[PDB]
Amino acid sequence: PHTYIKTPTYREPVSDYQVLREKAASQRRDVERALTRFMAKTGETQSLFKDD
């Protein structure tokens, strides 16, 4: 085959509903955590506990 046979090949597609739900959920949770920590650090802040 190597002498004259060519087939294109693609990357492995992840079409799984479980891991797609997990990816979208974790990315949404991480971006909202990053956003709220950035907005609490660059403004006036409160803290339920001391030095928090």
Q: Does 46 bind another protein (CB under 8 A)?
A: yes
Smallest distance from another protein to CB 39, Å: 7
| Interatomic CA distance for residues 8 and 22, integer angstroms | 31
| Token pair belonging to 32 | 């909202």
CA distance 45 to 32: 17
Would you give the binding string for another protein spanning residues 10-29, x where CB under 8 A is met?
Answer: --------------------
Where does this chain bind another protein (CB under 8 A)? 32-33, 35-36, 39-40, 46, 48-50, 52
